[PDB]
Design a protein around this ligand. Structure first.
Ligand SMILES: [Cu+2]
Ligand SMILES: [Zn+2]
Length: 260
């Protein structure tokens, strides 16, 4: 929110608190997931990812990442169960990634950084619209999935192949008839905790659900992410890499596990 924040030395995560003081708040994201301290929670309900009727619309370079946007005017693609009360509707997904394969994720697992992290963003339908949802402590649910470099992910290739058409900030392209189920791992085992948006405005509205099993993507797929630009057309080229916030203090939170 507001202008001029980014991921450089002069406007990156260490600077955000000056315009977004909640950056130093009590439930900021991402965090390190200490797997030995997370506790199994038998009260968690089964997690339900219901994306069969998902209706993708468009892909946009917003100068911070790229978003694949969905029709959220009806319950076409929803997340329910797990730690969640009620129904959360899919609005968009995006990624965070590194300049090198050893960094890029926002969450870490026993301090391990993955090459990238996928965020599927959903809003609680009891609040009527996304903008109202971000005024509520249970307004959003983000499903986070780690990416490691190995074999190609077939379900990612349609995304990689459109990126040359959205190289610079402000560009968009049609992205209809995409199935986001092709981005999931086999297992839905997860960790969950209460947190925030990981970019400005850093609002403390998110139930995080982070899957334990990473997806594998090829070196060639992640290399195509790294050819995007932060800048607009006609401006000095600034590669879109290292668009991740580091782990923040856990403070008075417990991370729960869905699995023993
Ligand atoms: Cu501003
Ligand atoms: Zn994100």
């Amino acid at each position: 929110m507001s202008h001029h924040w980014g991921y450089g030395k002069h406007n990156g995560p260490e600077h955000w608190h000056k315009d977004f003081p909640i950056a130093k708040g009590e439930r900021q994201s991402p965090v390190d997931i200490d797997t030995h301290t997370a506790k199994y929670d038998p009260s968690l309900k089964p997690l339900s990812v219901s994306y069969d009727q998902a209706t993708s619309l468009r892909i946009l370079n917003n100068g911070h990442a790229f978003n694949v946007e969905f029709d959220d005017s009806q319950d076409k693609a929803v997340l329910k169960g797990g730690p969640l009360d009620g129904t959360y509707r899919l609005i968009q997904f995006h990624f965070h990634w590194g300049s090198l394969d050893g960094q890029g994720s926002e969450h870490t697992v026993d301090k391990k950084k993955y090459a990238a992290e996928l965020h599927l963003v959903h809003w609680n339908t009891k609040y009527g619209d996304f903008g109202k949802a971000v005024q509520q402590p249970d307004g959003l649910a983000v499903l986070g999935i780690f990416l490691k470099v190995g074999s190609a992910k077939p379900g990612l290739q349609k995304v990689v192949d459109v990126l040359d058409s959205i190289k610079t900030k402000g560009k968009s392209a049609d992205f209809t008839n995409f199935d986001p189920r092709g981005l999931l791992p086999e297992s839905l085992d997860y960790w969950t905790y209460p947190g925030s948006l990981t970019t400005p405005p850093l609002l403390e509205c998110v139930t995080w659900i982070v899957l334990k099993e990473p997806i594998s993507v090829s070196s060639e797929q992640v290399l195509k992410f790294r050819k995007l630009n932060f800048n607009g057309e006609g401006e000095p080229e600034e590669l879109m890499v290292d668009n991740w916030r580091p782990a923040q203090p856990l403070k008075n939170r417990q991370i729960k596990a869905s699995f023993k």
